[PDB]
Each structure stands twice: as C-alpha cells, then as structure tokens.
Design a protein around this ligand. Structure first.
Ligand SMILES: O=S1C(c2ccc(O)cc2F)=CC=C1c1ccc(O)cc1F
Ligand SMILES: O=S1C(c2ccc(O)cc2F)=CC=C1c1ccc(O)cc1F
Lengths: 8, 220, 226, 9
C-alpha cells in the first residue's frame, strides 16, 4: 500500500 | 499526550502544521488532468499534516489509513473553499489556477459540484471564518469522518473546547458561542455531501496516479 | 420566532409521527420481498413525514418551492435517524417496524445492504452510549430538515430558526445538570453524527437508484429522480 | 408533483 509507506 | 495541551497550544500546533499552497502545472481532458495532478501532490502534504494533528499519531497504522481514506476529499475541499474566501464566485485551486462556474462546464457534471463548493465559500465568507477556526474544522473532519467504520472522541471534545475558547476571545457571548459552534459543524454535513458526490464523479472518470487509485478503490 | 425552549420541545414532541407497521408475514421466507417490505414502509412514512414537516416551527413560513426542496434532500436522512432512534433499546438490531426487527445477517439477503446496515447499527449504538433523549432527538430531526438543503432573504430566516433549535438543545442539556463545557461538547457530538447520517443517506440514494434500474412507489420515484 | 400536492393538502 502506497498510503502505508507515506505514513512511515 | 495531546489531551494535556492548552487551547492556545492546540491552535499553535495546528497552525504550524498547515500544509503549503501548491501551484498548478481549456479542454475537459486537460482540466481534469490539472486537478487530479494537483490533488495527488497535495495528498502527500496532507499525510504529513495528519501526523502533526494532535492525537492522530497515537492511533494505530490501520486506523490512520482508514481515517485518511475516508476524509481525504473532504479535507481537500474545505482547503479549497478556505483559499477561495477572498475570491467571490471563484475557486482558487492554485494561485495560478482560479476558476469560475462557467469554466467548470468544461467537464460534464462538474458544474454541480462547483456550485456547492462556491456556496460553501460564500457561507464561510458570510460567517467569516477565521484561520484558527478553519484548522480546527479540518482536523475534526480527519478524526470524525471515519470514526464509525474512546481516544478519538476525547480528542474531538478537546477541539470543541478549543473552538469555544477561540470564540470567547473574539468577544462572543455564551449564546453566540453555542450558535456559531453549531453553524460551523452543520457545514461539515454538506462538505461530506460534496465529497460523496465528488467521489462517484471521480470513480466514473476512472472507469490517475496509483495513490489516487488506492484512495478511490477504498470507497469502492 | 417567539417560543420558549420548553414551548419548542412540546411542539415538536406533539408533532411526532406514529410508528407504522410492516406487512411482514412470518410464514413467508426472499430478496425481492424483503426489499419490498422496506420500500413499502418507506413509502407510508413519507406521507406522515410531509405532514410532520408542516408542524416543524418555521417550515410553514417557507415557500412551496423551498418546502419541496428541503424534503427531497432530507427525506432519507429523516427516515434513517428515526429508524436509528427506534432501534436504541435493541442492540445489534434494526427496528424498521414493531413487527419487523432485523439484524446484519438478514441484511445480507440484499447485495450491498450489509454496509448500510452496519452504519445504521453503529449510529444506534452511538445514541445508546450518549443516552440520547427524545427531546434531543426531535431537535436533531428538525435540524436535518432545515439544514440539509439550505445551501443547495429566506436563508437567514431558516438560520434564525436553526439558531433557536441550538438554544433549545443547550437549554435541555443545562436542565440535565450538565456544565457549560459539557453542554458544548455534547452539542458538538450530536451534530457530528448528522455528518454520518448524511453519508448513509448518500450511499442509500446510490443503492436505491441502482434498484430502480434493476426493477417502488410513484412518490418514492419522485424523490429518487430529484 | 406528488410531493407538492401532499404539501398543499
Ligand atoms: O479534485 S477535486 C478538488 C480539489 C483538488 C485539489 C485540491 O488541492 C483541492 C481540491 F478541492 C475539489 C473537487 C474535485 C473533483 C475532481 C475530479 C472529479 O472528477 C470530481 C471532483 F469533484
Ligand atoms: O428503506 S430503507 C430505510 C428505512 C426505511 C424505513 C424507515 O422508517 C427507516 C429507514 F431507515 C433505511 C435504508 C433503506 C434502503 C432500502 C432500499 C435500498 O435499496 C437502499 C436503502 F438504503
């Protein structure tokens, strides 16, 4: 998930 | 951690966490391209802004994702509406991208959403919303919109305390504080409405960056 | 414009629509019938809702065009918050009618209906946790009617009435022994729920318009094409 | 306009 990476 | 903050500490935290105003790069395809490109770049900043929202970091990774997936279009819209306050009848997507309703006719079904967005801006203009109130409303959207599908509610209560505190500084009476609070929160009901209408209109256009496609398929 | 907060409440309570019954037959099983039960029920309530709206303070002062507009926008929201309210004392269940109590498993009888069911249940659980009062309920429901379609001279009149309802809500909370901080918080919590009710309605309109193409009463079709 | 008729009644 792209959203997972950006949140981390 | 965020519950120990003061009302002024809450405001200053939200103000300093504000994302930047990005710039944009005629026809229907070109206009749709500019908006979605601008929206995608803006999403990256929104995510970093979310982590700076008091209490949001205390949430698990799964819950953070869910809240963002649910409210991302609402957050974009209220930001657009906020930027367009000093431009009646116009929507300031970017400093180099100011559009009216007739330009919204370039895309089919876009004029209806344009009218609603313009109506919200004049409503904010009539009331006239303060920046301190705006950042409170936007953070409320992030925490509330997906809370259904203890901590979040306590943080929500604190933002309410902050909103009342701000209105008390402005010299509003107790009765005026209740009413203005209610007026602001009822607007969120329509921001939700615009988001849902904009959500289905965007899904039809899809049938876009992979990030946007992740956000869209989350509601599908 | 001139009514005590106590006078506002009593007027709304007296204007409350009755609880209608379904045509649900326990001898019967289907997806078509179960949908027909809800839509038929959601057709007979509308007649009562229309007459209920006329008794909502300030609604009669609006033009016919404005009255039609507010109802076309909020009719499903008003139905939903009523359902949610009736289902408060029935955990994990939706009380569409006294003879029609459904859970999320029975919502699986219709495709895509389980999502709306869970949201309605969560809303009902919210009112239960907050211990929502009937006086607060009739205020919220009247707010929905006047607010949902106000943006989309008579504008600030509605806002003035809406401000009066806000004062009424605060007046109720103050009588319950809530502090000023608690009044503001509870007021905020109740109004944030309206955002969710709007969301459920929008999804409800989608699923309902989808069923129309699949192939509902004539009155319900007017609301859908609106 | 069924809604209009019921409102007028
Ligand atoms: O991208 S949008 C948008 C927006 C975009 C970038 C932005 O920074 C702020 C915004 F509000 C408001 C409405 C949009 C929209 C965009 C595409 C579509 O098919 C439907 C829509 F409603
Ligand atoms: O009839 S419905 C309904 C309802 C009906 C009667 C009522 O009194 C309250 C309600 F909430 C809530 C969701 C309904 C629904 C019914 C059919 C459909 O395709 C989609 C829907 F959301």
């Amino acid at each position: 998930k792209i959203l997972h990476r950006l949140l981390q | 951690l965020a519950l120990s903050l003061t009302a002024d500490q809450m405001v200053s935290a939200l103000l300093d966490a504000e994302p930047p105003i990005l710039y944009s790069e005629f026809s229907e395809a070109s206009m749709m391209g500019l908006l979605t490109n601008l929206a995608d770049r803006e999403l990256v900043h929104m995510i970093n802004w979310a982590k700076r929202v008091p209490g949001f970091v205390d949430l698990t990774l799964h819950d953070q994702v869910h809240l963002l997936e649910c409210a991302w279009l609402e957050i974009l819209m209220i930001g657009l509406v906020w930027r367009s306050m000093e431009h009646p009848g116009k929507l300031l997507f970017a400093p180099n991208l100011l559009l009216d309703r007739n330009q919204g006719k370039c895309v089919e079904g876009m004029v209806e959403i344009f009218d609603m967005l313009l109506a919200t801006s004049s409503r904010f203009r009539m009331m006239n919303l303060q920046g301190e109130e705006f950042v409170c409303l936007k953070s409320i959207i992030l925490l509330n919109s997906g809370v259904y599908t203890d901590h979040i509610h306590r943080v929500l209560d604190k933002i309410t305390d902050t909103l009342i505190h701000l209105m008390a500084k402005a010299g509003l009476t107790l009765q005026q504080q209740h009413q203005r609070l209610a007026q602001l929160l009822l607007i969120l009901s329509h921001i939700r409405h615009m988001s849902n209408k904009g959500m289905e209109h965007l899904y039809s256009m899809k049938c876009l960056s992979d990030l946007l496609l992740e956000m869209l398929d989350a509601h599908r």
